[PDB]
Amino acid sequence: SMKALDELVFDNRFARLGDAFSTHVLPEPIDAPRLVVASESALALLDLAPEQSELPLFAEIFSGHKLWAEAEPRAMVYSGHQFGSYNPRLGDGRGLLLGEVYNDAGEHWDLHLKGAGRTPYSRMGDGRAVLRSSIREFLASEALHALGIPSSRAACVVSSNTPVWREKQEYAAMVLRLAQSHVRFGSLEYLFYTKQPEHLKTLAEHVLTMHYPHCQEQPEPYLAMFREIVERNAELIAKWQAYGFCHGVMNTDNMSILGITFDFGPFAFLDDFDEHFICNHSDHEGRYSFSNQVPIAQWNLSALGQALTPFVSVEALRETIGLFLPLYQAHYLDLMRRRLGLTVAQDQDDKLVSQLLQLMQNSGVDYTLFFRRLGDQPAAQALRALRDDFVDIKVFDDWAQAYQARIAAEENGTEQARKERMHAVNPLYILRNYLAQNAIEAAEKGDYEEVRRLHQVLCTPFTEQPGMEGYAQRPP
Numbered sequence: 247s248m249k250a251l252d253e254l255v256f257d258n259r260f261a262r263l264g265d266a267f268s269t270h271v272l273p274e275p276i277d278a279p280r281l282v283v284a285s286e287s288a289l290a291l292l293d294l295a296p297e298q299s300e301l302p303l304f305a306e307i308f309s310g311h312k313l314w315a316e317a318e319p320r321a322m323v324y325s326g327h328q329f330g331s332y333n334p335r336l337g338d339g340r341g342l343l344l345g346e347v348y349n350d351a352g353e354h355w356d357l358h359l360k361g362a363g364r365t366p367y368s369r370m371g372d373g374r375a376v377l378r379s380s381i382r383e384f385l386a387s388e389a390l391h392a393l394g395i396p397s398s399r400a401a402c403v404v405s406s407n408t409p410v411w412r413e414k415q416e417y418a419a420m421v422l423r424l425a426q427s428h429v430r431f432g433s434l435e436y437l438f439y440t441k442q443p444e445h446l447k448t449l450a451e452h453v454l455t456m457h458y459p460h461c462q463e464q465p466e467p468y469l470a471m472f473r474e475i476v477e478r479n480a481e482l483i484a485k486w487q488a489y490g491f492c493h494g495v496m497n498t499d500n501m502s503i504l505g506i507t508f509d510f511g512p513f514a515f516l517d518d519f520d521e522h523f524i525c526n527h528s529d530h531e532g533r534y535s536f537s538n539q540v541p542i543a544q545w546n547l548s549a550l551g552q553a554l555t556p557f558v559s560v561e562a563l564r565e566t567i568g569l570f571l572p573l574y575q576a577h578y579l580d581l582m583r584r585r586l587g588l589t590v591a592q593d594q595d596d597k598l599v600s601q602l603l604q605l606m607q608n609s610g611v612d613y614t615l616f617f618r619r620l621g622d623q624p625a626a627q628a629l630r631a632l633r634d635d636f637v638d639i640k641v642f643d644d645w646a647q648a649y650q651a652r653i654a655a656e657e658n659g660t661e662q663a664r665k666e667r668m669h670a671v672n673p674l675y676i677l678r679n680y681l682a683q684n685a686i687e688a689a690e691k692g693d694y695e696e697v698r699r700l701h702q703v704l705c706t707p708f709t710e711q712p713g714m715e716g717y718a719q720r721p722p
C-alpha cells in the first residue's frame with residue numbers, strides 16, 4: 247500500500263562502496279520551498295501517493311531542509327569526454343544521491359536531488375539549478391517515460407526564492423531524479439584513467455551484480471555485460487531517432503550505464519523535421535546534432551570499452567561495438583514501420599522511411615503531427631490532406647503511392663484497427679519547447695497550473711483529451 251514519508255526503507259548500497267567512489271555531502275537548503283509539480287507514476291516507484299507530495303515536509307526534504315536519518319547523501323566522482331576532449335575530473339557538482347529506497351516490489355531506486363548545493367566537485371559553480379532547468383528536466387523525464395522511451399524519472403520540482411544568477415536574475419529549484427543507477431560511462435573512465443584497478447573492478451562488479459547479474463555465470467562476465475549495454479544503447483538511440491528527441495550533450499559522463507536517457511539540459515523534441523537540427527546553442531560544431539546522435543552513441547560505447555580493456559581483449563570489445571549499428575537499424579526500422587502502421591518487415595522498408603525523411607527535410611513538416619494525421623484517416627484520404635505541406639508535392643505523391651502499395655503488400659487489418667495501432671505509437675501531444683516555455687513563464691510568476699496541466703496531458707500522449715487541443719498544435 248501507499249505509505250508515509252516516515253515509512254520509506256533505505257538501503258544505501260553505493261554509499262557502502264566507500265569514499266573512493268563518492269563523498270558524503272549534505273544539501274544546502276533553499277528558502278521558502280513550494281511544490282511546483284509532482285509525478286504520480288514516479289512517486290509510485292517509492293510507494294508514495296500524490297497526496298504525500300503536497301505535504302510541507304515533502305517540500306522541505308527535497309529542497310534541502312530536512313532528511314531521514316536513514317539516508318546518507320553522497321556526491322559521486324566521475325570524469326568524461328566533453329565534446330570529444332577528456333576531462334579528468336568531473337563528478338556530482340550540483341546534485342546528491344540522498345540514498346536508495348527499497349520499495350515493496352523489492353526494487354532499489356536512487357533518490358538524487360539535483361540542485362542540492364555545492365560539493366567537492368562543483369569547481370566554480372554555485373551548485374544550483376534554476377526553475378526553468380528543473381521544470382524542463384521534470385517534464386521531459388516523465389514525458390519520455392510515458393512515450394515508452396527509457397529515461398531517468400522525475401518525482402517532483404520544488405521552487406524557492408533563493409537568488410541564482412545565470413544570464414539574468416533567476417531562482418533556485420530542485421528536481422528529485424529517480425533511477426536505478428546514477429553510474430555513467432564516465433564513472434568507469436575515471437577509475438580507469440586514474441589507474442585505480444581495484445576500485446575500477448569494484449565498480450564494474452557493482453554494476454554487474456546489481457544490474458546485469460545474468461552475465462555473472464558466463465565465461466567473460468564483463469564482456470557479456472558490455473554486450474548488454476551496447477544492446478540497451480542501440481534500443482535507446484533507435485527511440486530517440488524514431489521520435490525526434492534531440493539530447494544536445496551526449497558527453498560520456500551523460501551516458502547512463504543502464505541505457506536510459508540521462509541529464510536533460512538543452513534538449514528539444516523536433517517540431518519541423520530536420521535531420522541535422524542542433525538543439526544546443528553551445529554545440530558550435532554540431533557534434534550532437536540529431537543525425538550525429540547515432541555515430542556519437544557508438545563513439546561513446548568505444549570510450550566505455552576502453553575502461554574495460556583491463557578485463558576484456560580489444561578484439562572482443564571492438565567486435566561487440568560492431569553490433570551497435572545493425573541493432574540500432576533493426577530497432578529503428580521496427581519503430582518506424584509501426585509509426586507507419588505496418589506489421590511485417592519487407593526488403594525496401596529502409597528506402598521507404600529514408601525517402602519520407604528527405605521529403606520532410608526542407609518542406610517544413612511537423613514530424614509528430616505527420617504520423618498522427620497519417621493514421622487518423624485511411625491512408626488515401628490522410629495523404630491527400632498532407633500533400634500540401636510538402637514543397638516537392640509531386641515527389642511526395644510518388645512516396646504516398648509507394649506507401650499505399652506497401653500497405654497493400656501485407657495484411658493490414660481494417661481501417662479502424664489500423665487507426666488504433668498507429669495512434670497507440672504516434673503521440674498527439676509531445677513536449678514542444680514553446681509549450682514548456684509557457685509553463686515556465688507562468689511558474690516563474692508563481693502560477694503552477696500550466697506546468698501541472700501540461701504534465702498531465704503528456705501522461706497519456708497517445709489519447710485525445712477534451713479541451714486540450716492547444717497542446718496538439720504546431721508551434722505558433
Ligand SMILES: Nc1ncnc2c1ncn2[C@@H]1O[C@H](COP(=O)(O)OP(=O)(O)NP(=O)(O)O)[C@@H](O)[C@H]1O
Pocket residue numbers: 336337338339340341367368369370371372373374375495499500508509510511
Ligand atoms: N551550477 C553548477 N554548479 C556546480 N557544478 C555544476 C553546475 N552546473 C554543472 N556542473 C557540473 O559540471 C559538469 C557538467 O554538467 P552537466 O553535464 O550539465 O551535468 P548536470 O546537469 O550539472 N548534473 P547531471 O544531470 O547529474 O549530469 C558536471 O560535473 C556537473 O555536476
Ligand SMILES: [Ca+2]
Pocket residue numbers: 509510511
Ligand atoms: Ca546538464
Ligand SMILES: [Ca+2]
Pocket residue numbers: 604605606607608609638
Ligand atoms: Ca525535401
Ligand SMILES: [Ca+2]
Pocket residue numbers: 609610611634635636637
Ligand atoms: Ca510545410
Ligand SMILES: [Ca+2]
Pocket residue numbers: 657658659660
Ligand atoms: Ca486486409
Ligand SMILES: [Cl-]
Pocket residue numbers: 374375376379
Ligand atoms: Cl541551472
Ligand SMILES: [Mg+2]
Pocket residue numbers: 499500509
Ligand atoms: Mg551531466
